[PDB]
Structure 1
Amino acid sequence: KKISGGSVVEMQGDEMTRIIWELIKEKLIFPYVELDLHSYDLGIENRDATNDQVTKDAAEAIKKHNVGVKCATITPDEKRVEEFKLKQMWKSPNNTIRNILGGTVFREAIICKNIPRLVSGWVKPIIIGRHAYGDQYRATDFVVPGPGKVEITYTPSDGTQKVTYLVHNFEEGGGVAMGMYNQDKSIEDFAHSSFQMALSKGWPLYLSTKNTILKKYDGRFKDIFQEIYDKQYKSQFEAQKIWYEHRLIDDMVAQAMKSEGGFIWACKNYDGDVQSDSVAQGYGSLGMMTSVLVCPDGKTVEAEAAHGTVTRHYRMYQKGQETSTNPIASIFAWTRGLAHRAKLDNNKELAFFANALEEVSIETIEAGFMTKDLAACIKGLPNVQRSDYLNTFEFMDKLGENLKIKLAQAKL
């Protein structure tokens, strides 16, 4: 007997993550759950075939059904075009999806009692609230061919005025230029959910910017946050014996490095992206981090793995070599989507399973069964022997059996 799951939007990806995603479905999802799954193949071949429409279609299904689970995808550059014989150098599916849905990507490492960190202090978790909208992820970058003038212009809707700003005057040779932006409502939602997360977890909140250099752009964030804090959350923080503090990114990164964790870190889009990878790695592995996009509507979520398609490990796989790619971040992408689905649908069993799987995952690693990366945390990469770890198939076989054991034990 399987659990009556509900409506889940599914997005298939590329390379190593594609191989893993199917193994998750085959072994951990479908033998226990019955879903009205809405699959979109966001692999580079089908994206190129549909002229990236499948990506737009996948984002719209998430709006409709409120739950989306995404597999890591290839964002094409010149090399990829040449590799896959692509029509165009397509935009990142994540950028496309995130700009349509909006909200905040909450990124948090998954801990195991036996997995040593690279950063000594981090005894308490760090949660990054990455602003999933605007900035460099909806930018307008172009190449300046030669001497000329680059200008950024603004024209209000009423046609009553116009502002022109000199970006630069290329007096000799060419170069590059780019325009980027953000909206107040998007920043406001970001602030709201950033403060809300701090209260639910009971931790101080930090907002990093470079407002000293970007006095207007970065200052708008600093102000919008502060205003909403003073006028809507200040008292509640004092109630919970926590605080909100804006800091320059410079200070912030150095502060976290020497901290002991236990704080919500509100991050501007780009900083969120880079810093979650620094954080993930500092705890242990890049394959050991949850990533959930919480939309401003309070009811829609998009869960994924923070890492990419693990191209390097996939090339070993193609060559027929031994592979040990971490599927935990991709497994939790499923458990987090299902956990929210259960919450939306008042589903006791689905919630139980979503959690059961997360516990199964951690327990297996805490039992000595892990991938190479996790073995490298224990013994150090140069000292890692073959017997120390399990391969991607071997590790999914252990998770599979342990999950069968756990659910059978649950039925009493």
Structure 2
Amino acid sequence: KKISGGSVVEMQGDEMTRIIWELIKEKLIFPYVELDLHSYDLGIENRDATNDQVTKDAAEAIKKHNVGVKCATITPDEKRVEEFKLKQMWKSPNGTIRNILGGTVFREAIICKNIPRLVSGWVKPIIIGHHAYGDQYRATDFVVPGPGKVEITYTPTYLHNFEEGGGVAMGMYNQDKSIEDFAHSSFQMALSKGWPLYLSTKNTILKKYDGRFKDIFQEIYDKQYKSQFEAQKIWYEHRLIDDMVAQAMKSEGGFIWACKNYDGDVQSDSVAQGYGSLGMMTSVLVCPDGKTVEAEAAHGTVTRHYRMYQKGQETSTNPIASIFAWTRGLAHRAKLDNNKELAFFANALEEVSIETIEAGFMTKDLAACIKGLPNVQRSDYLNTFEFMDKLGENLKIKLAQAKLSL
């Protein structure tokens, strides 16, 4: 008999990750787990053909069933429009889903003991959350073509005066609800992992903007979470950005870092490339309710490897991030459904994945972290299919051993 997994929304993606996604389902998931599966094809051709409606349908399904697992997808640019003769330069499906669900995306590395990190002291990951654009947080910019007068007004006035040539201008807004969501999601994520949370900001050039974040986080923390935080021996703290990197540099990890800048970062984003390889980084979209999540690999579709696969050439694409999307999705599914057997399985597959790598069986990217790419020989790593087979083989052994303990 298989494990009764329950309701899961799955989203198929593009290029190399799509290949790997099917191998994961065929070899690691479906042999052991029966799922009420709600499948949406977010591959670029089906998105074009549906006018991106499939992305919206998928997001609504996640809102309804609480658990999404998604494969990496192509975000179209001009070259992609010419390649697929697309109808429009469609918006990132990640953006569209995150917008509809209202969540915050949190990136978390998978640490293996034999893989170097930026800072060798890190034994647990530092989870980094971002405040991204949505329905209630957006910006327009435009080319100021010549001399004039830019103003920004509020109707129930704030000035430049352009007297010489041209330039550019912009505007940006943020509703309290958008910030409250970001706060809620971040506290929910902290309670889930049992780790402390830090909101980072900088400097206060836009003082009234950053102050609204600090205040909203503090208000929500004091009134709805502090009791639950102390209960788990954890805390919330606002922190400056420089003190945040300082702390990261000198810690073992195991905290959540909610980053607040004007749609990205230089040093938040630097920590997330400091765990060796892009194949070891997952995303989890966490909604304010605590109840709904969407799991996804943080990397892209791995186009370069896909082109090799199309020419029949050997690839060594790391499936770990994609596997951990399934395991973190299924783990959340199990917590909602109170399903002991599925929670066990999800954890088992995570253990097998790390054990396999720690035992010396790995894809080329991870071999390169250890040895340096110039020193990597073919004997040092497995190809995409060899590594998936090795995982599949170890997973079977692990679950067989579990069953043999009565």
Q: Deviations over 1:149-202 (max 9, x none)?
A: 44444334xxxxxxx433x45545544443333221232232234345445655
Asked if structure 1 preserves the Cα contact closer than 8 Å seen for 2:137 and 2:174, the reply is no
Q: Which moved more, 1:245-254 or 1:114-123?
A: 245-254
Q: Which of the residues 340, 348, 354 maps onto 1:356?
A: 348
Go from structure 1 to structure 2 and tell me whether the alpha carbon gap of 1:180 and 1:13 turns closer, same or farther (over 3 Å shift): farther
Deviations 1:119-158 (A, max 9, x none): 23323431223335549984334444444544444334xx
Any unmatched runs of 5+ in structure 1? 157-163
Structure 2 residue matching 1:148: 3-state secondary structure = coil
How many pairs were matched up? Answer: 404
Instruction: Quote the sequence identity (%).
Output: 100
Change (3 A) 1:232 1:245: same
Identify which range, 66-75 or 98-107, moves more after superposition.
98-107
- How far off is 1:293 after superposition? 1.2
Distance in 2 separating the partners of 1:327 and 1:370: 10
CA 1:141–1:113: 2 relative to 1, 3 Å: same
How far did residue 400 of structure 1 move? 1.1
Alpha-carbon distance in 2 for matches of 1:104, 1:19: 28
Report the CA distance shift for 1:93/1:174 in structure 2 as closer, same or farther (over 3 A): farther
* Bigger mean CA deviation after superposition, 133-142 or 279-288: 133-142
Structure 1 pair 270–356 and aligned structure 2 pair: CA distance change class (3 A): farther
**Larger mean Cα displacement after TM superposition, 13-22 or 274-283:** 274-283
CA distance in 1, matches of 2:137, 2:49: 24
**Residue number in structure 2 paired with 1:34:** 34
For residues 245 and 71 of structure 1, the distance between their equivalents in structure 2, rounded to whole angstroms, comes to 34
Relative to structure 1, is the Cα distance of residues 115 and 247 closer, same or farther in structure 2, using a 3 angstrom cutoff? same
Once the two structures are superposed, residues 227-276 of structure 1 have per-residue CA deviations (whole angstroms, 9 ceiling, x without a partner) of: 33445555766676655432333443354234432322112376667656
Q: Rate the CA distance shift 1:369–1:227 in 2: closer, same or farther, 3 A.
A: same
For residue 62 of structure 1, report the CA deviation from its aligned partner.
Answer: 0.6
Distance, in Å, in 2 between the alignment partners of 1:63 and 1:392 is 33
**How far does residue 82 in structure 1 lie from its aligned partner after superposition?**
1.6
Return the alpha-carbon distance in structure 1 between the equivalents of residues 76 and 374 of structure 2: 33
108 and 273 in structure 1: CA distance in 2 versus 1, 3 angstrom threshold: farther
Query: Structure 1 residues 16-25 or 317-326, which shifts more?
Result: 317-326
Please say which of residues 326-335 and 229-238 is displaced more in the overlay: 229-238
Worse overlay, 143-152 or 363-372: 143-152
Q: TM-score w.r.t. structure 1 length?
A: 0.88
Query: Which range moved further: 284-293 or 181-190?
Result: 181-190
Shifted more, 383-392 versus 98-107: the winner is 98-107
Q: 1:23 to 1:143 in 2, by over 3 A?
A: farther
TM-score w.r.t. length of structure 2: 0.89
CA contact (8 A) 1:191 1:224 kept: yes
State the alpha-carbon separation in 2 of the partners of residues 320 and 231 from structure 1: 59
Where structure 2 has 5 or more consecutive residues not aligned to the other structure, the ranges are none
Q: Distance in 2 between matches of 1:13 and 1:169?
A: 48
CA shift in 2, pair 1:351/1:307, >3 Å: same
Change (3 A) 1:240 1:401: closer
Distance in 2 between the 1:136 and 1:145 partners?
Answer: 29
| Higher deviation after alignment, 311-320 or 375-384 | 311-320
- Classify 1:220/1:284 alpha carbon distance in 2 versus 1 (closer, same or farther; 3 Å): same
Pick which of 350-359 and 225-234 moved more. Answer: 225-234
- CA separation in 2, counterparts of 1:71 and 1:273? 24
Q: Shift of residue 92 of structure 1?
A: 0.7
Report the Cα distance in structure 2 between the residues aligned to 1:399 and 1:209, rounded to whole angstroms: 41
**Is the 1:18–1:71 contact (alpha carbons within 8 Å) kept by the matching residues of 2?**
yes
Residue 300 in structure 1 maps to residue 292 in structure 2: yes
CA contact (8 A) 2:62 2:294 kept: yes
Contact kept in structure 1, 2:128 and 2:259, CA below 8 Å: yes
CA–CA separation in structure 2 for the residues paired with 1:179 and 1:254: 32
Task: Work out the CA distance in 2 between the residues paired with 1:10 and 1:324.
Answer: 24
Q: Secondary structure at the match of 1:37?
A: strand
1:342–1:150 Cα change, 3 Å: same
Q: Distance in 1 between matches of 2:162 and 2:311?
A: 48
Shift in Å, 1:213: 1.5
